From Swiss-Prot:
It comes from Thermus thermophilus. Keywords: Cytoplasm, Elongation factor, GTP-binding, Nucleotide-binding, Protein biosynthesis. One of its GO terms (cellular component) is cytoplasm. SUPFAM superfamilies: EF-G C-terminal domain-like, P-loop containing nucleoside triphosphate hydrolases, Ribosomal protein S5 domain 2-like, Translation proteins. SMART domains: EFG_C, EFG_IV. Catalyzes the GTP-dependent ribosomal translocation step during translation elongation. During this step, the ribosome changes from the pre-translocational (PRE) to the post-translocational (POST) state as the newly formed A-site-bound peptidyl-tRNA and P-site-bound deacylated tRNA move to the P and E sites, respectively. Catalyzes the coordinated movement of the two tRNA molecules, the mRNA and conformational changes in the ribosome. One of its GO terms (molecular function) is translation elongation factor activity. It holds the Pfam family EFG_C. It is found in: Cytoplasm. This is Elongation factor G.
Length: 656
């Protein structure tokens, strides 16, 4: 019942509106006449449908899902052909090397043009599409579908998925079918030497010979077999299913994932169900009454229900309570998920997405790399009035338990609460989750960039606090040398206090006030960083001293030192990567340069080009629409944090 050869782990890549959801749903319908991953069945194949992100830019989720699916269906709206948006979702497939087939959807829709599609695919994407199918009918007359591989035709009696008849190819479409058949063999001839031979002599190849060669080329990323239909009026879905099993890869056809032994060495992980367990956790979902569901793909070895596993990322042993397969209609409990297969593990306390599971006494290997994102975007949230402020913090602190990659700071100047994430999009869904599904209404603020403040020469300063009746006596007096630290060494404190000069009991108070003051620098009231303070002197007033006095004396001192230390602002600098059609190389580079950018070099990927760059996060507000309207919809970028830099003198004189 389990055969790797017969797994088909796919995802459905689709443009907004192209029909992703409707295609997926109809695929579940047809496979069901018998959720992060939904399993189903087709002619003795298990298809695991990986849910891909609902818009392309979600870059992390993207990487995580493409990694876990094997093949893919790309869906096109055959009224537009390939859109700007359809182009972006192709590049992702191209980017992550995932073997693909196309689906010309919406064939019943006015403007339905198969060839509008096929051409844009060769033309704009450099795709080498192959006509696997011919349509019978046009728009509202789109009646059926011809298969030019097997030279059989299909007709659909209704929009419902209820009437299908295998017909002979109408004589009227018989010339065109014969045309695209020999072209198909012509294509398969590039992948099978004995089909070439057979081609040359006018010998018809076997139906299998032909499928195998299409498959081989689809998988090696050399061709993109193309199919069509209407998901909405149920036409051609079964054939597309058919195609998934035909041409789309099993766990075996794609090269194996790589991971790192604990000695630092990189290994290919090979899909042996009787080899060592190794598995990636790639999504957590909090099922209502089943519990906290944690979705995995198993790369090698077997995962057995009731067993104990070792989480190698968070180095702690977990226990696998139940194993589930999520179907369309129901949940199915299973004893075991073998190499190449997928599902959900129940129980599992401290495992978050990214985490690697191995089998207790198996190699302590690590599949997914490190970097936690610097929280570079801040956002303020005035609640309602103590109203939604009630449950927001309660919902924040469990939401911080399937995302460790975002800060929560209470801003102590004006008062609001501060969430700090990595991207604008990061903060936007965290906001839709706040308001929609955890019922928090509030004044959500505008995305401000996480600026910092530091000094550029050493200082030698003092702070005092001195009260006399108001209403008892107060005294605190320190002296500090503050010097610059290297970029991102952060805070260092040193106590060069002699002996009794400041009584040992007050040093904490000094440190507290120093830290307290460093949360608001003098330039733009942002956090102070990368400095080394040394308390070297001071004084005290013998009755009148106190923790309060020394604390303030430290705030004071610290704030003064920053004003004096030729202070400067630090801003986040992003590593940006722009995917442009080659015709816009120049006009896109100039814009980047115009955002104080600095180019690192364009390597081509596909028939596209990919420009690398450094650009201040501050200048990236609305790059998405700027690119779109400078590549004509066809551009797409990815940003990742790199480092902090001094702002130019111009920008400081501006931010204040
Ligand atoms: N005419 C037509 N409309 C379709 C077809 N497939 C999907 N749609 C429509 O496209 C709209 C959005 O579809 P959806 O699957 O949500 O697209 P998505 O945003 O890319 O996920 C819906 O109104 C669907 O009814 C099709 O084959 N023909
Ligand atoms: Mg959708």
């Amino acid at each position: 019942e389990y055969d790797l050869k017969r797994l088909r782990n796919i995802g459905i890549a689709a443009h907004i509106d192209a029909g992703k959801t409707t295609t997926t749903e109809r695929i579940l319908y047809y496979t069901g006449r018998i959720a992060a991953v939904t399993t189903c069945f087709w002619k003795d194949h298990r298809i695991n449908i990986i849910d891909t992100p609902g818009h392309v830019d979600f870059t992390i989720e993207v990487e995580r899902s493409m990694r876990v699916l094997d093949g893919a269906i790309v869906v096109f709206d055959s009224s537009q052909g390939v859109e700007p948006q359809s182009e972006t979702v192709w590049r992702q497939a191209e980017k992550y090397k995932v073997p693909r087939i196309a689906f010309a959807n919406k064939m019943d829709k006015t403007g339905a043009d198969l060839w509008l599609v096929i051409r844009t695919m060769q033309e704009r994407l450099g795709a080498r599409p192959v006509v696997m199918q011919l349509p019978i009918g046009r728009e509202d007359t789109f009646s059926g579908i011809i298969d030019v591989l097997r030279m059989k035709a299909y007709t659909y009696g209704n929009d419902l998925g209820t009437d299908i008849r295998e017909i002979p190819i109408p004589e009227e479409y018989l010339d065109q079918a014969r045309e695209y058949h020999e072209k198909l063999v012509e294509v398969a001839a590039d992948f099978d030497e004995n089909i070439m031979l057979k081609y040359l002599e006018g010998e018809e190849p076997t139906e299998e010979e032909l499928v195998a060669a299409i498959r081989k080329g689809t998988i090696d990323l050399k061709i993109t077999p193309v199919f069509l239909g209407s998901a909405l009026k149920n036409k051609g879905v079964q054939l597309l299913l058919d195609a998934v099993v035909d041409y789309l890869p099993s766990p075996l056809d794609i090269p194996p994932i790589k991971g790192t032994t604990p000695e630092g060495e990189v290994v290919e992980i090979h899909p042996d169900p009787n080899g060592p367990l190794a598995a990636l956790a790639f999504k957590i979902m909090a099922d209502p009454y089943v519990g906290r569901l944690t979705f995995i793909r198993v790369y090698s070895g077997t995962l057995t229900s009731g067993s104990y596993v070792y989480n190698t990322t968070k180095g702690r042993k977990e226990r696998v309570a139940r194993l589930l397969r999520m179907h369309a209609n129901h949940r199915e409990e299973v004893e075991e998920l073998k190499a190449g297969d997928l599902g959900a593990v129940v129980g599992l306390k401290e495992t978050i997405t990214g985490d690697t599971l191995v089998g207790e006494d198996a190699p302590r290997v690590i599949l997914e790399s490190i970097e936690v994102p610097e929280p570079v975007i801040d956002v303020a949230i005035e609640p309602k009035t103590k109203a939604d402020q009630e449950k927001l913090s309660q919902a924040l602190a469990r939401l911080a338990e399937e995302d460790p990659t975002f800060r929560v700071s209470t801003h102590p100047e004006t008062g609001q609460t501060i969430i700090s994430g990595m991207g604008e999009l990061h903060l936007e869904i965290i906001v839709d989750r706040l308001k929609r599904e955890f019922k928090v209404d509030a004044n959500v603020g505008k995305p401000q960039v996480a600026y910092r403040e530091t000094i550029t020469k050493p200082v030698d300063v003092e702070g005092k606090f001195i009260r006399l009746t108001g209403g008892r006596g107060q005294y605190g007096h320190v002296k500090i040398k503050v010097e610059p630290l290297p970029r991102g060494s952060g805070f260092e404190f040193v106590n060069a206090i002699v002996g009794g000069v400041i009584p040992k009991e007050y040093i904490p108070a000094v440190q507290k006030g120093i830290e307290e003051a460093m949360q608001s620098g003098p330039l733009i009231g942002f956090p102070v960083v990368d400095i080394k303070v040394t308390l070297y002197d001071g004084s005290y007033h013998e009755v009148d001293s106190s923790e309060m006095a020394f604390k303030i004396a430290g705030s004071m001192a610290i704030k003064e030192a920053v004003q004096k230390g030729d202070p400067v602002i630090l801003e986040p600098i992003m590593r940006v990567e722009v995917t442009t059609p080659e015709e816009y190389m120049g006009d896109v580079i100039g814009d980047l340069n115009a955002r104080r950018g600095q180019i690192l070099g364009m390597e081509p990927r596909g028939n596209a080009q990919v420009i690398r760059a450094f650009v201040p996060l501050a200048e990236m507000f609305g790059y998405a629409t700027d690119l779109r309207s400078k590549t004509q919809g066809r551009g797409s970028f990815v940003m990742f944090f790199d480092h902090y830099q001094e702002v130019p003198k111009q920008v400081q004189e501006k931010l204040i």
